């Protein structure tokens, strides 16, 4: 006499009240660890986390008992769909912890792996802060080369065997969950089956990402062409005005953001951009003044004040005493009305705008706090960091800084400073989209099985050249796993999170400013003192995950899908300026070019029998003897012609454009100096003294 | 001059859980209501039928003081015509209720580090409570069609749940001590007046 939906509603009310408490104990144990790192707080975190996990997996199996088909209510269907999702609960105890063994291994190898300087083997540098300091600050071609190649050789090669068993187990897990692959498993974040109209497919995410990207590529090419022209003045002798950009000159280890190339590509370095760090320390600004003035910004747009529990339990300063703390900035929704922010706040402009960003996460958390426990999250995986970023966009404006006293009433922004601002934004916002687009498409192909493991790197670099316009400084065979050199890849983190969020920011931003009656360019808007904008924004923040993200997006923008047009509208003043700066330039890259094809030797392997006969048919270790044979020829050459004892090894012979069993190119570098490529005719001389060679 | 013992109800060191809400009958005494409404200690002093003022001028044949502890989110349910886990299953006030509902924050007293789980509330019941009815039942609630046999199981849940009272919760989840004064005028001698 009681319907199944009535049985699951009773079951969910039974789940909600202990899940809300067990999740509060796990976060409180994790919070006390993050603000006080000890050896008994780690176990308290691991104990409460294991108790919270074991309870969730227990209810997750009892949730599959209820058929999702016989439930016509919609808000209740979402809690089951989120609870009936096993995850890795579908695998054997053998395969599960072997999978956990790989993920833990890939994390420590990433966080503890080092790269040693070829000039001093005793100077072995970690990524943070060692290698990142080099890749984010240095302008030396060779210094960035050994750090770029070293990180991917010493540490990246160790992740290749781990990532191969990783892809196999995660796909094996996803297929048991009735998914296509692990990439299709990730794309279920955006999948929606509502009644009609507000639906969303998983294959549709593939189509929408590609459609938006070809609308971004025009803006990216002129930015790529401009940065290429400006780095010629920084790196002459190393880049060609027609080919791709070397991977180790893009501002960081992977080229994720081009922000650190701003001093080299500044449009008008004569004029500095707006920095309010000095204006704050002269005004006696402290950590509480930053958050209280950030609090007055959200209440000015119609959002509630911060809780008093937020001002007593949050840690907004680094402890003065002996207390090691994690203070990578995070916003915490512990539950039961407990919201705090953990941050080593300094009196700087960057820490000023991140405060508005992390407080934006808090306002989002407090809004959907009235929803059931299984619906207390963003509409999709990109709404949270997008809502926080539109707060810093309006807070960093000259209009807002003019109102809070950090910039004088005698302020006027000229034509050049906004070109400086929009480019520094483009190096961070526009420069990461092709990198974010290609990394996920690569992992989507690998999970799907479209790219075999014997061509993982050969395809990875073909798309960096074609999609991102970035070329390897040295060729990487199938012993490298360069994608795994990123934090999000070696730690099982989805990366399309940062691509859709970027589209979601300016989609929200343009819609909120038209409500605020903003006139002029979009990068000049400020939603401050606009109640009708924040309350319209608060309408979506209340929904959380109770409604499909196409519905939640339409409540704010008036459209149910990703629209890149607001993003291109945000950078139109710069896109208009880059085109006139690129008239006498090349817009685009030639995929053929490389920093080493200038001195490499084409080689055509002799097919002494029909192709397809493994009688001889050179393979990987026949290439090993070849690279050792040329290494021997280079040893005799320098010793007999130059009286120089130089220990060439197979690792000095780099093979590129390798088509197995048929053809390849190769060049030679000096030991300990991958920057020093041996001249080609000097190498061809060593081969003549001791297949086809084209010349 | 027998003043009504309001100190034993309000200043009590420990209150009862709402599913077993405690009631004390106050009779043939002198009630000063000035100590109650003129006090800034209470966050909620909503009165129905009666008024906060014009209360030392009336005479009732009894006065009942229902005292209990709920969360801050559920204090709004202590009112005529309200719906919720407290009003439906724990403590229901009639539609024509004549009296005062008094509540105040007690994070100082009823919350503890690690958790305070001594306060309980009924989560499941076959039907809604009638006004001023108390249910201290402990039978296993059967939501489905199979008998529970007195043990917790699938679609068979224990009806009474505990509150999680840590001092770090938001005020919505913090403990609130509630006192409900009901005024009684009958065919009776009109015990309690108060100048
Ligand atoms: C509680 O006791 C204090 C003294 O112990 C007294 O001043 C106060 O009036 C009492 N409150 C009530 C409501 O009886
Ligand atoms: Zn954030």
Numbering used by the authors:
A (entry chain A): 18 to 707, 722 to 726
B (entry chain B): 333 to 527
Lines quoted from the article behind this entry:
Herein, we show that dog angiotensin-converting enzyme 2 (dACE2) can bind to the SARS-CoV-2 spike (S) protein receptor binding domain (RBD), and that both pseudotyped and authentic SARS-CoV-2 can infect dACE2-expressing cells. RBD is responsible for receptor recognition, which had been mapped to the CTD in previous structural studies. dACE2 shares 83.88% primary sequence identity with hACE2. When infected with the authentic SARS-CoV-2, the number of copies of SARS-CoV-2 ORF1ab obviously increased in HeLa cells expressing either dACE2 or hACE2 at 48 and 72 h after infection, compared with that of cells not expressing these two molecules.
The RBD/dACE2 complex was prepared using size exclusion chromatography and the structure was solved to 3.0 Å resolution, with one RBD binding to a single dACE2 molecule in the asymmetric unit. For dACE2, clear electron densities could be traced for 596 residues from S19 to Y706 and L721 to G725 as well as glycans N-linked to residue N342, while the electron densities for R707 to S720 are invisible. The structure of RBD in the complex includes residues T333 to P526, all of which have a clear density. In the complex, 18 dACE2 residues (Q19, L23, T26, F27, E29, K30, Y33, E36, E37, Y40, Q41, T81, Y82, E325, N329, K352, D354, and R356) form atomic contacts with 18 RBD residues (R403, K417, G446, Y449, Y453, L455, F456, A475, F486, N487, Y489, G496, Q498, T500, N501, G502, Y505, and Q506). Among these contacts, 118 are Van der Waals (vdw) interactions, and 14 are hydrogen bonds or salt bridges. The contact interface in the RBD has a saddle shape with two protrusive side parts and a recessed center part, and can be divided into two contact regions (CRs), CR1 (R403, G446, Y449, Q498, T500, N501, G502, and Q506) and CR2 (K417, Y453, L455, F456, F486, N487, and Y489). In summary, slightly fewer residues are involved in forming the interaction interface in the SARS-CoV-2 RBD/dACE2 complex (18 SARS-CoV-2 RBD residues and 18 dACE2 residues) than those in the SARS-CoV-2 RBD/hACE2 complex (19 SARS-CoV-2 RBD residues and 20 dACE2 residues), and the total number of atom contacts, hydrogen bonds and salt bridges in the SARS-CoV-2 RBD/dACE2 complex (127, 13, 1, respectively) are also less than those in the SARS-CoV-2 RBD/hACE2 complex (145, 15, 2, respectively).
